[PDB]
RNA sequence: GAUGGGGAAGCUCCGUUUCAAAGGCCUGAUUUUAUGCAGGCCACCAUCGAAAGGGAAUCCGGUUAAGAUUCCGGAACCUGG
RNA sequence: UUGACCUCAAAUCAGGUAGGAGUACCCGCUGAACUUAAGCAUAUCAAUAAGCGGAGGAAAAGAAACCAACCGGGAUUGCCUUAGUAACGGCGAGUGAAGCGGCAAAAGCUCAAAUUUGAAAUCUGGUACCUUCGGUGCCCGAGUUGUAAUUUGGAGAGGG
């Protein structure tokens, strides 16, 4: 997997940037109902099936 | 009589081929330069590790467009900053961006160019 | 802040290209300052000005091409009307109104008359 | 190539097999000397050209429209009659003095009955060689039939 | 003119003259491709009465079609059902071979419209047809009042929907008591006769 | 696994040099201009298929919190022009 | 030798066109079984589901090679009715239209087959210009192996 195609690495980059908690100022908006990041992914729990 | 044919194989004869002379243009407005100097060089990288190379190795670190190759990066650096480039090394970072290590020739100092740009 | 489209339209293409280069230099300079300051909202104004200048340049270049093809039966496809694919394949008004000489004579001789049941 | 080979084998196949008399009569064509004499007479009655028709109309317009003529300021034309439908009608009305028949018509049914029609109507006919040659005297690429109805004294 | 003689002579197919012509022509067709362009109609009289005109925009194509029944395409003949449906060999295709010829020519020239077709020749293996095609993009057709109806989008792929003369024959589109099942479409008639109609005030 | 072809109502199937008019680099000819025009050459006739098969060419020393036969210093080699 | 014709090719030749999607409704092809018959094979489910090809704002059908047997009606489509009827069916289970009558909506038509023959009178394209969903002039080409005008059965045509 060290020798990887560009398609695999590009999707790996996208998953890396999405692995963050919810920004705090989102909860302070008017009529906000989002409490947490429901799509959080961790490498030890669910695989990407890429 | 008849033409003398020394070969029993018949082949397609060669006929005149004309070049295109369109009645109207395909797009009528050429697109501008898709990768100019300001698009090849996006912004300098100013992490602590990158700053050491500027002071020590005479190397400037830049974030560049994913579509730019080493020829375009060298040409852009010379035109934007009026310097000379010895060689360029590039890599694709884990976040999907391209980083270029640009080493200047001995006639130029990477430190005084870096603060001329504004970053330190 | 920002450029005005109506002001740009009163300028030639030589000085429109120069302004585009000047804005590109300014945008690059602001990117360096963004790496040291906590926030820098001025970056958005320069980007929109670059978009506005490119729009005005494109309008002038396309308009000059329209004058070059004025009256000619063939024009570039990007300068033709869009409509839909089906509408562009339909018969024109002239073609859809064609009749034979046999039918034209009948129409002139016996048209739909106007009448009323009064007396 | 395939189109060349199919072209030569069809010629062979049409003579290897027996040919019925209705089709076999077209193997006899007018000889060189008589055909040359025939075309000399037919060349004297060429149809008017498009350019020549231009002069007649502009002369006729300047003659009858302003001169109050009876549309008869021009002499009666003499020309070779052509057209398969036109010529067949002329033969059925006993108006053709001589009919030329081409032996090269690939859809042969178009012309296969003409010798019998001419024979029954009493119109002399000749099977001449070359449909392209007949077209030359009617300003066409191909004519496949030609006829004379009225000839100068 | 000569068209009248052509019509009557074509009906004597077993005369000595026509037997000779049909033998030499059936060989010539077999040496060409299954579908190929024809420079001119081989039966100009027959083409005219089907709507053909000798002007730019009219195209003639020739096509051969295999004869015989339609074998059921099942592996090894097994049908996996009741014995009433176990037939394999004596089954007949509901469309004619003439219809099949038009369909394959239609796909070959998808920029054209199929007008009509007619029989020309046959042997033990193939039946031969010539298909009449009209170009809906040519200005000679779009400006022609008698033929610009074909340019309407409702007439695209007439042979695919059985709107040609051979298509309407196989659909049973005729008048009279003999065509009660297929007067105005077999499936539409079946829907009408199998529909329960209820009104607001029940009858 | 395309094409040329032949099957199949059809989605598609067969077949891989096949019943095909299947193509281009050595120049000469030209100083209107770019390559039209003369000999001859060659008929091989798509493409995909290996990070363990075949295959042009790099080594030592040093350096980072985390990279290196890729960076630094020194010393070589191959291909194209 | 040269110039035509016919047929067949080539070009990143000039200008166009086809594919895919959607698919409730529409036009065709192909095509079951569960089920019912208190078993079951014909039958039934059903000329249905699934599969495949092709359209539109509607589609299809349509101006009789019709219905009738009457004092006759008069293109097509839909509604009410005819009618669970005539008829079909191991005449078992089951299946099953049509003419008339009332109504909604109403609309008619054109090619082939004839010599313009004292005049291919017809048409694509190119080009210049203009009043540009087109028009005029000019020039090639298509076409007599038939393009216009004229006539479609209710008629109609050539003469007086
Ligand atoms: Cl990795
Ligand atoms: Cl017709
Ligand atoms: Mg690298
Ligand atoms: Mg295959
Ligand atoms: Mg490979
Ligand atoms: Mg390591
Ligand atoms: Mg082209
Ligand atoms: Mg049972
Ligand atoms: Mg039971
Ligand atoms: Mg059972
Ligand atoms: Mg279905
Ligand atoms: Mg639509
Ligand atoms: Mg409606
Ligand atoms: Mg319709
Ligand atoms: Mg009628
Ligand atoms: Mg009725
Ligand atoms: Mg039933």
UniProtKB/Swiss-Prot annotation, chain A:
Lineage: superkingdom: Eukaryota
Subcellular location: Cytoplasm
Keywords: Cytoplasm, Ribonucleoprotein, Ribosomal protein
Main localization category: cytoplasm
GO cellular component: cytoplasm; cytosol; cytosolic large ribosomal subunit
Pfam families in alphabetical order: Ribosomal_L39 (PF00832)
Region described as Disordered: spans on this chain: 1-21
Gene Ontology MF terms: structural constituent of ribosome
GO BP term (any one): cytoplasmic translation
Biased composition (Basic residues): 6-19
Subunit structure: Component of the large ribosomal subunit (LSU). Mature yeast ribosomes consist of a small (40S) and a large (60S) subunit. The 40S small subunit contains 1 molecule of ribosomal RNA (18S rRNA) and 33 different proteins (encoded by 57 genes). The large 60S subunit contains 3 rRNA molecules (25S, 5.8S and 5S rRNA) and 46 different proteins (encoded by 81 genes). eL39 interacts with YIH1.
Stated role: Component of the ribosome, a large ribonucleoprotein complex responsible for the synthesis of proteins in the cell. The small ribosomal subunit (SSU) binds messenger RNAs (mRNAs) and translates the encoded message by selecting cognate aminoacyl-transfer RNA (tRNA) molecules. The large subunit (LSU) contains the ribosomal catalytic site termed the peptidyl transferase center (PTC), which catalyzes the formation of peptide bonds, thereby polymerizing the amino acids delivered by tRNAs into a polypeptide chain.
Record-stated family: Belongs to the eukaryotic ribosomal protein eL39 family.
This protein's name: Large ribosomal subunit protein eL39
Swiss-Prot record, chain B:
Membrane spanning stretches: none
GO MF annotations in UniProt: RNA binding; rRNA binding; structural constituent of ribosome
Subunit note: Component of the large ribosomal subunit (LSU). Mature yeast ribosomes consist of a small (40S) and a large (60S) subunit. The 40S small subunit contains 1 molecule of ribosomal RNA (18S rRNA) and 33 different proteins (encoded by 57 genes). The large 60S subunit contains 3 rRNA molecules (25S, 5.8S and 5S rRNA) and 46 different proteins (encoded by 81 genes). uL23 is associated with the polypeptide exit tunnel.
One GO term of the biological process aspect: ribosomal large subunit assembly
Organism: Saccharomyces cerevisiae (strain ATCC 204508 / S288c)
Similarity comment text for this entry: Belongs to the universal ribosomal protein uL23 family.
Cell compartments where the protein resides: Cytoplasm
Superkingdom assignment: Eukaryota
Record keywords: Cytoplasm, Isopeptide bond, Ribonucleoprotein, Ribosomal protein, RNA-binding, rRNA-binding, Ubl conjugation
A GO CC term attached to the entry: cytosol
Keyword RNA-binding among record annotations: yes
Main location, first listed in the record: cytoplasm
Protein name: Large ribosomal subunit protein uL23
Per UniProt, location of the Glycyl lysine isopeptide (Lys-Gly) (interchain with G-Cter in SUMO) cross-link in this chain: 39
From Swiss-Prot, chain C:
Record keywords: Cytoplasm, Phosphoprotein, Ribonucleoprotein, Ribosomal protein
Residues bearing the modification Phosphoserine: 12, 49
Principal location listed in the UniProt entry: cytoplasm
Compartment(s) of residence: Cytoplasm
Biological process per Gene Ontology, one example term: cytoplasmic translation
Single GO MF descriptor: mRNA binding
Any one GO CC term of the record: cytosolic large ribosomal subunit
Note: There are 2 genes for uL29 in yeast.
Oligomeric and partner information: Component of the large ribosomal subunit (LSU). Mature yeast ribosomes consist of a small (40S) and a large (60S) subunit. The 40S small subunit contains 1 molecule of ribosomal RNA (18S rRNA) and 33 different proteins (encoded by 57 genes). The large 60S subunit contains 3 rRNA molecules (25S, 5.8S and 5S rRNA) and 46 different proteins (encoded by 81 genes). uL29 is associated with the polypeptide exit tunnel.
Protein family (similarity comment): Belongs to the universal ribosomal protein uL29 family.
Role description: Component of the ribosome, a large ribonucleoprotein complex responsible for the synthesis of proteins in the cell. The small ribosomal subunit (SSU) binds messenger RNAs (mRNAs) and translates the encoded message by selecting cognate aminoacyl-transfer RNA (tRNA) molecules. The large subunit (LSU) contains the ribosomal catalytic site termed the peptidyl transferase center (PTC), which catalyzes the formation of peptide bonds, thereby polymerizing the amino acids delivered by tRNAs into a polypeptide chain.
Protein name per its UniProtKB record: Large ribosomal subunit protein uL29A
From Swiss-Prot, chain D:
Gene Ontology process terms (BP): cytoplasmic translation; maturation of LSU-rRNA
Compartment list: Cytoplasm
GO CC, any one term: cytosol
Keywords: Cytoplasm, Ribonucleoprotein, Ribosomal protein
Gene Ontology molecular function, alphabetical: RNA binding; structural constituent of ribosome
The family this protein is said to belong to: Belongs to the eukaryotic ribosomal protein eL8 family.
Entry function: Component of the ribosome, a large ribonucleoprotein complex responsible for the synthesis of proteins in the cell. The small ribosomal subunit (SSU) binds messenger RNAs (mRNAs) and translates the encoded message by selecting cognate aminoacyl-transfer RNA (tRNA) molecules. The large subunit (LSU) contains the ribosomal catalytic site termed the peptidyl transferase center (PTC), which catalyzes the formation of peptide bonds, thereby polymerizing the amino acids delivered by tRNAs into a polypeptide chain.
Misc. comment: Present with 238000 molecules/cell in log phase SD medium.
Assembly, per entry: Component of the large ribosomal subunit (LSU). Mature yeast ribosomes consist of a small (40S) and a large (60S) subunit. The 40S small subunit contains 1 molecule of ribosomal RNA (18S rRNA) and 33 different proteins (encoded by 57 genes). The large 60S subunit contains 3 rRNA molecules (25S, 5.8S and 5S rRNA) and 46 different proteins (encoded by 81 genes).
Protein name: Large ribosomal subunit protein eL8A
Species per Swiss-Prot/TrEMBL record: Saccharomyces cerevisiae (strain ATCC 204508 / S288c) (Baker's yeast)
